[PDB]
């Protein structure tokens, strides 16, 4: 029932991270300028705005059950803010290099950060934000981390070393390493959220999106059409579609059964960097963000 309606678009400095609040009509953007913005996209008024640092903030997530946002920046630091009171509840150096990605466990007090220091780190906010584990094995920047929603005792890391690695919490080596054949690296990895397919999806600078059966490790499909680096590709949680975005300036919506492109959108904000799904979706670009309703 595709009726792509424009909910709220605003101009800003380059949006590197983006996330939806699960119960309030809010979107968080994290900017290359070091600023982060929480917008109510129904009233189109900012609920909170922070100049966090002067370095890019590439990663940001709500932690709704604690009334927090958590962000990571190129100054090597993870910071957490209560979005109700605005005050900074934690501020620590997480890696000795850029932070690319942050994932929040859906029930347990765990945060994963992936970094240019070649590692993923696990932080426990009920143990004083202690470093509980470092996952070592990747050979280049870890660009993306994501829990398996159907078994969040495992998670995947996407890396510029051209691999995805799937790990078990508390275990020192990958359960398996996925050789993608995406020779310019993996920028993003996402899980299909429903129980009927054991699918992961990867995006690459080599212009491809690939679908993976994580039980057999086989490539199910390869999605081609983007004309520059693919920043992300995700399964929509409720619609039978895949959504991707690229430095060619476009969003693409693909059929998740046939793997053929259904729609290409140039929202006029130059290169696309990040994605969030709530049929709301939101993407951050060089020149701002857009919140879209698909139906």
């Amino acid at each position: 029932k595709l009726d792509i309606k424009k909910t709220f678009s605003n101009r800003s400095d380059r949006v590197k991270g983006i996330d939806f609040h699960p119960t309030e009509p809010w979107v968080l953007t994290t900017l290359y300028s070091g600023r982060v913005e929480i917008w109510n996209y129904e009233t189109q008024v900012e609920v909170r705005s922070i100049q966090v640092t002067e370095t890019p903030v590439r990663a940001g997530k709500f932690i709704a059950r604690k009334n927090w946002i958590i962000v990571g920046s190129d100054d090597f630091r993870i910071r957490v803010f209560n979005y109700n009171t605005g005050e900074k509840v934690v501020d620590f150096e997480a890696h000795p290099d850029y932070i690319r990605s942050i994932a929040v466990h859906p029930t347990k007090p765990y945060v994963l950060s992936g970094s240019d220091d070649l590692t993923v780190k696990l932080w426990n906010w009920e143990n004083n934000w202690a470093l509980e584990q470092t996952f070592e094995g990747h050979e280049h920047f870890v660009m993306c981390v994501a829990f398996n929603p159907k078994d969040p005792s495992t998670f995947a890391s996407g890396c510029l070393d051209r691999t995805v690695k799937v790990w078990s919490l508390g275990q020192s080596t990958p359960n398996f390493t996925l050789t993608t054949g995406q020779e310019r690296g993996v920028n993003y990895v996402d899980y299909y959220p429903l129980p009927d397919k054991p699918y992961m999806i990867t995006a690459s600078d080599d212009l491809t999106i690939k679908i993976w059966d994580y039980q057999t490790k086989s490539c199910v499909a390869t999605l081609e059409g983007h004309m520059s680096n693919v920043s992300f590709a995700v399964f929509h949680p409720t619609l039978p579609i895949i959504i991707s975005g690229s430095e060619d300036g476009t969003l693409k919506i693909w059929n998740s059964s046939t793997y053929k492109v259904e729609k290409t959108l140039n929202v006029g904000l130059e290169r696309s960097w990040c994605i969030a799904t709530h049929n709301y979706i939101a993407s951050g670009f060089d020149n701002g963000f857009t919140v879209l309703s698909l139906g």
């Binding site: 290359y32 920047f141 510029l160 290169r271």
Partner: peptide, 6 residues
């Protein structure tokens, strides 16, 4: 040199 600097 830092890849993916942008």
């Amino acid at each position: 040199v830092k890849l993916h600097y942008t």
